Design a protein around this nucleic acid. Sequence first.
RNA 1: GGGGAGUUUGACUGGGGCGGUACACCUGUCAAACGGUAACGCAGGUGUCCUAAGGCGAGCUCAGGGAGGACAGAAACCUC
Length: 170
Amino acid sequence: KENPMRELRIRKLCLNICVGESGDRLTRAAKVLEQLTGQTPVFSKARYTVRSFGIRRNEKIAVHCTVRGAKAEEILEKGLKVREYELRKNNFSDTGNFGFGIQEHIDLGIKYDPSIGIYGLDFYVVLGRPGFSIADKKRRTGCIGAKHRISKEEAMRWFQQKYDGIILPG
RNA sequence: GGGGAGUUUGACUGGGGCGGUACACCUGUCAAACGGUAACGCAGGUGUCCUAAGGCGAGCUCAGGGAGGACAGAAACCUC
Ligand SMILES: [Mg+2]
Ligand SMILES: [Mg+2]
């Protein structure tokens, strides 16, 4: 048997692009990201100052956004279609989440505009389960127990069964 | 305008002088489980800075570590 609603569902999908310098490149990356995600993304300032990468304290160097639900699985389907539903054993974290990256963006269904240029990005997905909001709600916060959490094997099974993908070793 | 006049040229202090400030303050210890308690005892700090680094209210949680993610690495950004 099974519990009808202890099943696995994706609860958020995070997209980010880290360009490493503020300016026209940054705002065009924000533009392509918001066109892809249908909503305005946000800028993240540099935490520290390191001159090896040519960055300083508190300038926007990356643009990221998060999605839930319908648009989340559509974007994830596009990304996995680009990655031909192929992932590696080490692509999955110990907490049940996973992710990957796309070297360039116009392949997943984005028209090439010569002005904006080309940009890669990182997809990440946080596998969830009904009741995970306990860990972050305000009134009576608590843990999510031991049985209810997600492990690497469960994430692998969910990926290979729902999206009929292949986990090549590596 | 030392030609001439009057006067002054601190204190502390293992003699005085040179050095130093133990000369006004602050922290720990000395200090002997109330408080107080000495030495040129020990380790140090002060003559500032702030329109917010003051005053309320709201919302968040930090250092670090582990596991993941294109360039990305020991270190850039995202997630748990
Ligand atoms: Mg005389
Ligand atoms: Mg006594």
